[PDB]
């Protein structure tokens, strides 16, 4: 039974023999390397007294993926100061009041706040919503907008479900199949965006009129991951059609950066809502696939396992997510090896560090029993 029921979170590092003191130190150090004055590793930058952002170092932009991640990280770490700086920047610079995506958040901005696009990215929205619910539950709603956290979360999720009913907009979930979309104006998906464990919580906390819908989305997503992951290797493509097969129209049909999050998501869902045979077997498959592969040699792979020449752009992120996946298969043949590999991998430096380092801190939090559900 998951932590949602027991309110106890597995410390897999401790279970695998790491000392409580060293785990405590490693979690804090990871946070400090990302959010402190450590220029080589840092991904969070403060602006003035009331703003801050996470920089996508690989593209020199600020993304809703990173901002929503940063808010989730901040609430897990009980850092309301950092949470509010990020959310303030997000509302000021990313929230759209105009155009077909009004009510969503521009997916990419320049560090100066300028929007690079008026299109949103659904995985940002869903993390914003849950981070905001957690903020409300830990700290209470603030007296002034936009710090009225729970109202902001419910409003945002309303738009995600109902957009287009009285306007030219589009929802972020397909209403018939209850699957999250890659972007509001398409009818395909992205396996890594599927967060059934988040939807379970939305089914408790969203507007009441949408709570059954969120239960249905959770179930739809669980079923969808079964058909999206390759049956032998466990690898999921970056984009996939609703029928579960890869969408490679623009090169996203393979196992690469986006896909890495699937193992992590499966890990977290197992920890929160309970183990399943499917999830354990799926994590066993991915870990078995990587068991005989050197991190320095990790590639892009077709989902059936065929290697490309191209190396993984984010191999530290791949390590972190595979290790986090161990939460879904704690007795798995490679579970300990994956956790140990991660323990022995430093936080990344250099221009591609943002994505790896986000996945890294999530894995550090989850594997130490510090990626929690914050209840009212
Ligand atoms: Ni120490």
In a domain, 8, yes or no: yes
Rounded CA-CA distance 241/231 in Å is 17
Range of the structural domain that residue 259 is part of: 1-369
In a domain, 212, yes or no: yes
Residue indicated by tokens 């005989």: 292
Report resolution in angstroms: 1.7
Gap from CA of 15 to ligand 1 centroid (Å): 18
Q: Are strands 108-109 and 299-301 parallel, antiparallel or unpaired?
A: unpaired
In a domain, 375, yes or no: no
The full DSSP string for 140-155 is: ---SSTT--HHHHHHH
Protein residues placing their CB within 5 Å of the ion ligand 1? 25
Q: Is the dihedral of CA 322, 323, 327, 332 positive or negative?
A: positive
CA-nearest of 143, 222, 239 to 188 is 239
Gap from CA of 152 to ligand 1 centroid (Å): 40
Assess contact for 297 and 319: CB atoms under 8 A.
Answer: no
Gap from CA of 19 to ligand 1 centroid (Å): 9
Residue 49's CB: how many other CB atoms inside 10 A?
A: 6
In a domain, 139, yes or no: yes
Rounded CA-CA distance 112/46 in Å is 12
In a domain, 256, yes or no: yes
In a domain, 118, yes or no: yes
- Structure-determination approach: X-ray
**Angle value at C-alpha 251, between 250 and 254, nearest 5 degrees:** 140
Gap from CA of 67 to ligand 1 centroid (Å): 30
Gap from CA of 25 to ligand 1 centroid (Å): 6
Assess contact for 283 and 265: CB atoms under 8 A.
Answer: no
The full DSSP string for 97-144 is: -SSTTBTBB-SEE-TTS-BS-S---HHHHHHHHHHHHHHHHHH---SS
- The domain total for the chain is 1
Q: Which residues contact 62 (CB under 8 A, 6 or more apart)?
A: 53, 54, 55, 56, 89, 93, 94, 108, 109, 110, 111
Using left for φ > 0, alpha for ψ between -120 and 50, and beta otherwise, residue 190 falls in: beta
The CATH number of the domain holding residue 275 is 1.50.10.10
Assess contact for 131 and 68: CB atoms under 8 A.
Answer: yes
Gap from CA of 22 to ligand 1 centroid (Å): 5
Gap from CA of 21 to ligand 1 centroid (Å): 7
In a domain, 334, yes or no: yes
Residue indicated by tokens 């032998």: 232
In a domain, 376, yes or no: no
Residue 8's CB: how many other CB atoms inside 10 A?
A: 10
CA-nearest of 252, 233, 263 to 323 is 263
Rounded CA-CA distance 265/197 in Å is 8
Gap from CA of 16 to ligand 1 centroid (Å): 17
Q: Which residues contact 42 (CB under 8 A, 6 or more apart)?
A: 33, 34, 35, 36
Gap from CA of 344 to ligand 1 centroid (Å): 14
CA-nearest of 254, 342, 372, 356 to 34 is 356
């Amino acid at each position: 039974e998951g932590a949602f029921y027991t309110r106890e979170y597995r410390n897999l590092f401790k279970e695998f023999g790491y000392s409580e003191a060293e785990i405590q130190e490693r979690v804090k150090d990871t946070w400090e390397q990302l959010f402190g004055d450590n220029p080589e590793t840092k991904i969070y930058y403060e602006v003035g007294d009331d703003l801050g952002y996470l920089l996508d170092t690989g593209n020199l932009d600020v993304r809703t993926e990173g901002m929503s991640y940063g808010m989730m990280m901040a609430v897990q770490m009980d850092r309301k100061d950092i949470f509010d700086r990020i959310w303030n920047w997000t509302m000021k610079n990313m929230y759209m009041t105009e155009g077909v995506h009004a009510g969503y958040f521009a997916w990419s901005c320049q560090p100066d706040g300028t929007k690079n696009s008026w299109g949103p990215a659904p995985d940002g929205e869903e993390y914003f919503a849950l981070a905001l619910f957690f903020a409300s539950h830990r700290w209470g709603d603030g007296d002034e907008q936009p710090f009225n956290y729970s109202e902001q979360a419910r409003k945002l999720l309303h738009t995600c479900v109902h957009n287009g009913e009285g306007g030219p907009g589009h929802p972020m979930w397909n209403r018939d199949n209850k699957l999250i979309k890659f972007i509001p104006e398409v009818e395909f998906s992205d396996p890594s965006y599927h967060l059934p464990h988040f939807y379970e919580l939305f089914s408790l906390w969203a507007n009441e009129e949408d709570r059954v819908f969120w239960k249905e989305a959770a179930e739809a997503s669980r079923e969808y991951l079964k058909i999206a992951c390759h049956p032998e290797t466990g690898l999921a493509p970056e984009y996939a059609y609703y029928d579960g097969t890869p969408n490679d129209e623009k090169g996203y049909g393979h196992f690469f950066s986006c896909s890495y999050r699937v193992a992590a998501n499966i890990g977290l869902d197992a920890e929160w809502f309970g183990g399943s045979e499917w999830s354990a077997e799926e994590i066993n498959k991915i870990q078995a696939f990587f068991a005989d592969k050197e991190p320095e040699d990790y590639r892009r792979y077709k989902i059936d396992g065929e290697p490309f020449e191209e190396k993984s752009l984010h191999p530290v992120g791949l390590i972190a997510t595979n290790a986090m996946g161990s939460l879904a298969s704690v007795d798995g043949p490679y579970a300990k090896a994956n956790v140990d590999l991660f323990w022995n991998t430093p936080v990344r430096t250099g221009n591609r560090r943002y994505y790896d380092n986000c996945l890294y801190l999530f894995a550090m939090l989850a594997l130490s029993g510090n990626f929690k559900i914050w209840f009212p």
